[PDB]
Write a protein that binds this ligand. Sequence first.
Ligand SMILES: Nc1ncnc2c1ncn2[C@@H]1O[C@H](COP(=O)(O)OP(=O)(O)O)[C@@H](O)[C@H]1O
Ligand SMILES: [Mg+2]
Ligand SMILES: [Mg+2]
Lengths: 337, 20
Amino acid sequence: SVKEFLAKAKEDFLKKWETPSQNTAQLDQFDRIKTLGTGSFGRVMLVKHKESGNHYAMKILDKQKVVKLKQIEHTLNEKRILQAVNFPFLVKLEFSFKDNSNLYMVMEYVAGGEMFSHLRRIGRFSEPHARFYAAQIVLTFEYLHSLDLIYRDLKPENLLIDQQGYIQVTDFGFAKRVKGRTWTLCGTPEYLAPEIILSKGYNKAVDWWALGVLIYEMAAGYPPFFADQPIQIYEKIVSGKVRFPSHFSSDLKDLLRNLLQVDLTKRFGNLKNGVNDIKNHKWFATTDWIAIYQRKVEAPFIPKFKGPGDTSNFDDYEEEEIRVSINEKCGKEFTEF
Amino acid sequence: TTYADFIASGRTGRRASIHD
Ligand SMILES: Nc1ncnc2c1ncn2[C@@H]1O[C@H](COP(=O)(O)OP(=O)(O)O)[C@@H](O)[C@H]1O
Ligand SMILES: [Mg+2]
Ligand SMILES: [Mg+2]
């Protein structure tokens, strides 16, 4: 069942991986409305597709900034992987294309906003609320990992809540197709596994660490390791002593000690039983994994939505003109985009 | 409290990815 599912999931993925989609829209097919969010470099805008009238989220990447930050390969990774995957909690890439100055990835617009904003506004999530989101990340990582994909940037800022209150994972910027180990220092400081930090080489178990960080932060309202600067955070991660809010249930604490486990022979996700050590953990005992995949569970929270194009679940951002030069920049570098 | 210390810290807003 899971085996037949993942197997055919894999054949579908490989066909798209081997022959990616290219150039399925162009800039003037869309009206740009408002910025939805921004990252290290580059921004996401709410746009309206002229001919269909549908709204989308358009991620704009300046090729020159990509090159300068040395993210060419990661950007090619991002698009090649996002156009090939298919899972109920992964955001859909609807179009991609490039022009003289920029790379564009047009996704389904997920109007409920970032988990981040809700989390900070509300304070923290009760354990059943946190568990419901966590479950979706567990299933998503089972899917991804099965394709030899590592995700590498789990955090509430890259998690979107859809109109049904379910999660949509976005930002495949550091996603990578790798069998065995890899070495890139990347992710977000609060979420980095200690082996990433220690320059050891690392594998997919870093996504299970990050899940532990996510679950903690969701339930606590603050991360397990915080400080004012990254370097202080790394220190605390490397120590690995973790302390839990007084309100955490015994089950939750036990799960987190097994995810935020500095020892890879003992971290959940990374063992002989694989994801089942997580799915069968006591904290998830009330979770109907089939029902979650099927999206039949009642969400704990359903965002307010006032008609298409509403951005009220998102912060406001400074807008700025998207330039497009008359000279092609970095054409060769991004040919396969 | 831990909460109070986090909230007074400078990383309570959206966090940027690193690629150090
Ligand atoms: N499909 C989407 N729908 C709505 N908002 C989105 C969508 N994708 C991204 N965003 C918003 O844009 C922000 C940046 O998108 P992201 O993919 O994480 O780019 P970056 O790599 O620069 O962090 C996200 O944190 C979120 O606020
Ligand atoms: Mg992001
Ligand atoms: Mg990113």
